[PDB]
Ligand binder design. Structure first.
Ligand SMILES: C[C@@H](c1cccc2c(-c3cnn(CCN)c3)c(C(=O)O)[nH]c12)N1C[C@]2(C[C@@H](CN)C2)OC1=O
Ligand SMILES: [Zn+2]
Ligand SMILES: [Zn+2]
Length: 232
């Protein structure tokens, strides 16, 4: 009924959208992993009379449900998708997208990691993002590689028309008490990577984490704080 939808509010298999700004939505789905249920976010950005998708909904069936929810709520075709790192909450569902007419993209680093680990593999490589601080334009967004954080390949996405910063899993929500799933993380480099995001996007108005509630710029400092303390 208007609040940001939360883990116990979304059965696994169902997807919700949340309007962030004009032409910008997040998508929220839930999935089971190792016997616990988690929410996760992605982004939808209006690209004229088409849509750009950022990240899958964490699984094939969730991603099919995402497409159906977009058709119901927005009614414009998803033509391209970008996955912001190689994990299943970002690429699981790429095969569904690829069979629904969507062109799927990720950095070569993400594609390699996804292939090596047995995750679904986006079709197209995004060059120009291999060094920290690199940025490229992709439709209505800018893609930015901040350096290693949650993963070595993680990308962030900025929507300049709306000053929306989608941090993906490199950014944690304010209620976070831990650095999340750190299996593939670089806790030593993570604060430096967050500082790069802070420096590059000082005018961000909304910051969206990979999991949990959006907020403002404080999510970046909070993330740095919880990762440093986790490492400690
Ligand atoms: C799919 C994703 C994943 C699964 C379950 C939970 C999370 C969380 C999470 C847990 N808690 N929270 C709340 C913290 N604010 C978020 C985050 C996040 O942190 O992005 N990703 C998660 N995988 C699995 C993997 C283990 C590796 C294979 N050995 C690959 O690593 C990784 O990320
Ligand atoms: Zn991850
Ligand atoms: Zn994640």
């Amino acid at each position: 009924s208007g609040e940001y939808p939360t883990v116990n509010e979304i059965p696994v298999g169902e997807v919700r959208l949340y309007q962030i700004a004009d032409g910008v939505w997040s998508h929220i789905a839930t999935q089971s992993f190792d016997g616990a249920v988690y929410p996760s976010n992605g982004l939808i950005v209006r690209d004229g009379d088409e849509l750009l998708l950022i990240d899958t909904a964490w699984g094939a069936k969730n991603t099919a449900a995402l497409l159906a929810e977009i058709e119901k709520q927005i009614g414009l075709p998803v033509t391209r998708a970008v996955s912001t790192h190689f994990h299943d909450d970002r690429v699981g569902g790429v095969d569904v997208l690829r069979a629904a007419g969507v062109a799927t993209y990720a950095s070569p680093s993400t594609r390699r990691l996804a292939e090596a680990e047995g995750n679904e593999i986006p079709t197209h490589s995004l060059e120009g993002l291999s060094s920290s601080g690199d940025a490229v334009r992709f439709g209505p967004v800018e893609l930015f590689y901040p350096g290693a954080a949650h993963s070595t390949d993680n990308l962030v996405v900025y929507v300049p028309s709306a000053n929306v910063l989608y941090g993906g899993c490199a950014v944690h929500e304010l209620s976070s008490t831990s650095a999340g799933n750190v299996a593939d993380a670089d806790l030593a480099e993570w604060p430096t990577s967050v500082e790069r995001i802070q420096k590059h996007y000082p005018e961000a108005e909304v910051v969206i984490p990979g999991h949990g509630l959006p907020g403002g710029l404080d999510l970046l400092q909070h993330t740095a704080n919880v990762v440093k303390a986790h490492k400690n």
